[PDB]
Scaffold this active site. Structure first.
Site, PDB file in Angstrom:
ATOM      1  N   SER A  43      12.073   1.628   1.084  1.00 39.53           N
ATOM      2  CA  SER A  43      10.986   1.213   1.971  1.00 39.53           C
ATOM      3  C   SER A  43       9.707   0.774   1.252  1.00 39.53           C
ATOM      4  O   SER A  43       9.446   1.152   0.111  1.00 39.53           O
ATOM      5  CB  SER A  43      10.666   2.336   2.962  1.00 39.53           C
ATOM      6  OG  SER A  43      10.343   3.534   2.282  1.00 39.53           O
ATOM      7  N   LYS A  44       8.924  -0.046   1.950  1.00 43.64           N
ATOM      8  CA  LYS A  44       7.626  -0.519   1.470  1.00 43.64           C
ATOM      9  C   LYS A  44       6.627  -0.511   2.623  1.00 43.64           C
ATOM     10  O   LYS A  44       7.023  -0.650   3.766  1.00 43.64           O
ATOM     11  CB  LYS A  44       7.765  -1.937   0.923  1.00 43.64           C
ATOM     12  CG  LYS A  44       8.650  -2.041  -0.309  1.00 43.64           C
ATOM     13  CD  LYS A  44       8.475  -3.390  -0.996  1.00 43.64           C
ATOM     14  CE  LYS A  44       9.201  -3.483  -2.332  1.00 43.64           C
ATOM     15  NZ  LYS A  44      10.464  -4.273  -2.241  1.00 43.64           N
ATOM     16  N   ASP A  62       8.301  19.640   7.481  1.00 45.22           N
ATOM     17  CA  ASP A  62       7.884  19.193   6.147  1.00 45.22           C
ATOM     18  C   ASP A  62       6.474  18.559   6.174  1.00 45.22           C
ATOM     19  O   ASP A  62       6.272  17.429   5.719  1.00 45.22           O
ATOM     20  CB  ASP A  62       8.917  18.219   5.552  1.00 45.22           C
ATOM     21  CG  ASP A  62       8.590  17.825   4.117  1.00 45.22           C
ATOM     22  OD1 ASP A  62       8.268  18.721   3.301  1.00 45.22           O
ATOM     23  OD2 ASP A  62       8.623  16.612   3.816  1.00 45.22           O
ATOM     24  N   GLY A  84       8.607   3.899  -0.631  1.00 44.23           N
ATOM     25  CA  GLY A  84       9.710   4.832  -0.867  1.00 44.23           C
ATOM     26  C   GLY A  84      10.782   4.119  -1.682  1.00 44.23           C
ATOM     27  O   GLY A  84      10.513   3.086  -2.311  1.00 44.23           O
ATOM     28  N   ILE A 138       0.817  -1.221   0.000  1.00 43.82           N
ATOM     29  CA  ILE A 138       0.000   0.000   0.000  1.00 43.82           C
ATOM     30  C   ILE A 138       0.848   1.266   0.000  1.00 43.82           C
ATOM     31  O   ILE A 138       0.415   2.311   0.499  1.00 43.82           O
ATOM     32  CB  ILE A 138      -1.019   0.005   1.182  1.00 43.82           C
ATOM     33  CG1 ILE A 138      -0.340   0.072   2.555  1.00 43.82           C
ATOM     34  CG2 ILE A 138      -1.890  -1.241   1.106  1.00 43.82           C
ATOM     35  CD1 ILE A 138      -1.298  -0.025   3.721  1.00 43.82           C
ATOM     36  N   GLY A 139       2.036   1.188  -0.592  1.00 45.26           N
ATOM     37  CA  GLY A 139       2.992   2.291  -0.519  1.00 45.26           C
ATOM     38  C   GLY A 139       4.434   1.846  -0.656  1.00 45.26           C
ATOM     39  O   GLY A 139       4.768   0.680  -0.387  1.00 45.26           O
TER      40      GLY A 139
HETATM   41  C1  LIG Z   1       7.011   4.633   2.143  1.00 45.61           C
HETATM   42  C2  LIG Z   1       7.443   4.765   3.583  1.00 45.61           C
HETATM   43  C3  LIG Z   1       7.546   6.182   4.108  1.00 45.61           C
HETATM   44  C4  LIG Z   1       8.793   6.808   4.173  1.00 45.61           C
HETATM   45  C5  LIG Z   1       8.930   8.092   4.655  1.00 45.61           C
HETATM   46  C6  LIG Z   1       7.821   8.780   5.095  1.00 45.61           C
HETATM   47  C7  LIG Z   1       6.545   8.211   5.059  1.00 45.61           C
HETATM   48  C8  LIG Z   1       5.362   9.019   5.554  1.00 45.61           C
HETATM   49  C9  LIG Z   1       4.665   9.866   4.512  1.00 45.61           C
HETATM   50  C10 LIG Z   1       6.432   6.902   4.564  1.00 45.61           C
HETATM   51  N1  LIG Z   1       5.147   6.286   4.513  1.00 45.61           N
HETATM   52  C11 LIG Z   1       4.439   5.788   5.552  1.00 45.61           C
HETATM   53  O1  LIG Z   1       4.864   5.715   6.702  1.00 45.61           O
HETATM   54  C12 LIG Z   1       3.090   5.286   5.214  1.00 45.61           C
HETATM   55  N2  LIG Z   1       2.646   5.326   3.948  1.00 45.61           N
HETATM   56  N3  LIG Z   1       1.397   4.779   3.980  1.00 45.61           N
HETATM   57  C13 LIG Z   1       0.644   4.679   2.731  1.00 45.61           C
HETATM   58  C14 LIG Z   1       1.065   4.404   5.260  1.00 45.61           C
HETATM   59  C15 LIG Z   1       2.142   4.710   6.058  1.00 45.61           C
HETATM   60  C16 LIG Z   1       2.134   4.454   7.534  1.00 45.61           C
HETATM   61  C17 LIG Z   1       1.047   3.488   7.971  1.00 45.61           C
HETATM   62  C18 LIG Z   1      -0.127   3.301   7.052  1.00 45.61           C
HETATM   63  C19 LIG Z   1      -1.280   2.648   7.482  1.00 45.61           C
HETATM   64  N4  LIG Z   1      -2.317   2.462   6.670  1.00 45.61           N
HETATM   65  C20 LIG Z   1      -2.208   2.920   5.409  1.00 45.61           C
HETATM   66  N5  LIG Z   1      -3.238   2.761   4.542  1.00 45.61           N
HETATM   67  C21 LIG Z   1      -3.538   3.491   3.368  1.00 45.61           C
HETATM   68  C22 LIG Z   1      -3.122   4.822   3.244  1.00 45.61           C
HETATM   69  C23 LIG Z   1      -3.413   5.526   2.099  1.00 45.61           C
HETATM   70  C24 LIG Z   1      -4.124   4.928   1.066  1.00 45.61           C
HETATM   71  C25 LIG Z   1      -4.411   5.757  -0.149  1.00 45.61           C
HETATM   72  O2  LIG Z   1      -4.111   6.951  -0.157  1.00 45.61           O
HETATM   73  N6  LIG Z   1      -5.016   5.128  -1.215  1.00 45.61           N
HETATM   74  C26 LIG Z   1      -5.592   5.869  -2.344  1.00 45.61           C
HETATM   75  C27 LIG Z   1      -7.113   5.771  -2.349  1.00 45.61           C
HETATM   76  C28 LIG Z   1      -7.692   6.521  -3.539  1.00 45.61           C
HETATM   77  N7  LIG Z   1      -7.136   6.020  -4.806  1.00 45.61           N
HETATM   78  C29 LIG Z   1      -7.741   6.716  -5.968  1.00 45.61           C
HETATM   79  C30 LIG Z   1      -5.668   6.132  -4.825  1.00 45.61           C
HETATM   80  C31 LIG Z   1      -5.040   5.366  -3.671  1.00 45.61           C
HETATM   81  C32 LIG Z   1      -4.542   3.604   1.196  1.00 45.61           C
HETATM   82  C33 LIG Z   1      -4.253   2.872   2.332  1.00 45.61           C
HETATM   83  O3  LIG Z   1      -4.618   1.550   2.578  1.00 45.61           O
HETATM   84  C34 LIG Z   1      -5.122   0.785   1.599  1.00 45.61           C
HETATM   85  F1  LIG Z   1      -4.404   0.812   0.489  1.00 45.61           F
HETATM   86  F2  LIG Z   1      -5.163  -0.470   1.998  1.00 45.61           F
HETATM   87  F3  LIG Z   1      -6.360   1.110   1.276  1.00 45.61           F
HETATM   88  N8  LIG Z   1      -1.132   3.553   4.915  1.00 45.61           N
HETATM   89  C35 LIG Z   1      -0.093   3.776   5.728  1.00 45.61           C
END
Ligand SMILES: CCc1cccc(CC)c1NC(=O)c1nn(C)c2c1CCc1cnc(Nc3ccc(C(=O)NC4CCN(C)CC4)cc3OC(F)(F)F)nc1-2
Length: 277
Positions: free
Chosen positions: A27-28, A137, A24, A21-22
């Site tokens: 990172s994943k 940020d 970097g 679900i994401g």
């Molecule tokens: C990558 C690691 C990283 C490094 C540095 C900094 C950071 C913080 C920003 C982070 N990144 C992070 O630390 C981070 N990135 N994500 C995405 C999450 C985290 C923390 C925990 C976390 C817990 N739950 C979720 N769930 C979801 C969060 C966002 C979406 C989303 O925006 N989907 C969109 C819906 C609409 N359509 C049109 C497009 C997609 C979908 C999600 O879950 C679901 F997918 F299961 F649904 N995500 C996160």
């Protein structure tokens, strides 16, 4: 895209992986289930090409997140983590959507909803400020919606990394300067809590007017120049909520000295005066 047979262990506990679900560079993030079918997000970070400075910034953010989650429920839960020389796994609270994505699919946001989110954001940021942390940020993507409540995901402490794995792909708002304060642009410490108030103000401005204040300027050097220039008057179109107008004007004063503080914002009538009959 979903992962259909995958699974991982974290501190002797097995997790079924539903999907990713994401991502970097190093990172994943995974939507996962534990042995009792409880849902979490696991952040994975590969450390294999990270130097001691970078490593220590990850260690610092983890320590602080583990501490500060007890001080406010507007910070994301970190239930467990595993940390070796090769990787970090963090087992974290799951949310169905982040604020960025939610705002992209909402033209008209409910006034009550906006006020509620504003409060959530203020409480989260106030908490990190109380332990000497200025995020520096803040964007909507740093906030996760978990059952209507915003949770701050990160504290801006960790050093970001680049895909030298490559097969390179990235997202709309990672590079963005639309939430950036004037003093940050001058700067190249001088990083104060007021930096975060400007960024929060830009998020609230988005929620109020439907865009960030300098969004119209495509040309990125003109945009940065507009953010600094005192003669560049920011628009604040008239709206029913006069308290909301006031908050935005107060957050987006370019002089950080004259810009409003977080404790002040918490006692502001926008947050405090009961609009309900
Ligand atoms: C990558 C690691 C990283 C490094 C540095 C900094 C950071 C913080 C920003 C982070 N990144 C992070 O630390 C981070 N990135 N994500 C995405 C999450 C985290 C923390 C925990 C976390 C817990 N739950 C979720 N769930 C979801 C969060 C966002 C979406 C989303 O925006 N989907 C969109 C819906 C609409 N359509 C049109 C497009 C997609 C979908 C999600 O879950 C679901 F997918 F299961 F649904 N995500 C996160």
């Amino acid at each position: 895209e979903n992962l259909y047979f995958q699974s991982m262990s974290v501190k002797g506990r097995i997790y079924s992986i539903l999907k990713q679900i994401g991502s970097g560079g190093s990172s994943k993030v995974f939507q996962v289930l534990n042995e009792k079918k409880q849902i979490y997000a696991i952040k994975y970070v590969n450390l294999e090409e990270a130097d001691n400075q970078t490593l220590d910034s990850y260690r610092n953010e983890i320590a602080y997140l583990n501490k500060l989650q007890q001080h406010s429920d507007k910070i994301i839960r970190l239930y467990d983590y595993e940390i070796t020389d090769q990787y970090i796994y963090m087992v974290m609270e799951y949310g169905n959507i982040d604020l960025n994505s939610w705002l992209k699919k909402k033209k008209s946001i409910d006034p009550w909803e906006r006020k509620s989110y504003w409060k959530n954001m203020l409480e989260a940021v106030h908490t990190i400020h109380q332990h000497g942390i200025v995020h520096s940020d803040l964007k909507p993507a740093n906030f996760l919606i978990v059952d209507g409540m915003l949770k701050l995901i990160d504290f801006g402490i960790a050093n970001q990394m680049q895909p030298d794995t490559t097969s390179v792909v990235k997202d709309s708002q990672v590079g963005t300067v639309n939430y950036m304060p004037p003093e940050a642009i001058k700067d190249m410490s001088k990083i104060s809590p007021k930096s975060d108030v400007w960024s929060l103000g830009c998020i609230l401005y988005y929620m109020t007017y439907g865009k960030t204040p300098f969004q119209q300027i495509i040309n990125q050097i003109s945009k940065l120049h507009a953010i600094i220039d005192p003669n560049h008057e920011i628009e604040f179109p008239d709206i029913p909520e006069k308290d909301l107008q006031d908050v935005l004007k107060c957050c987006l004063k370019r002089d950080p000295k004259q810009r409003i503080s977080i404790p002040e914002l918490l006692a502001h009538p926008y947050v405090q005066i009961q609009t309900h009959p």
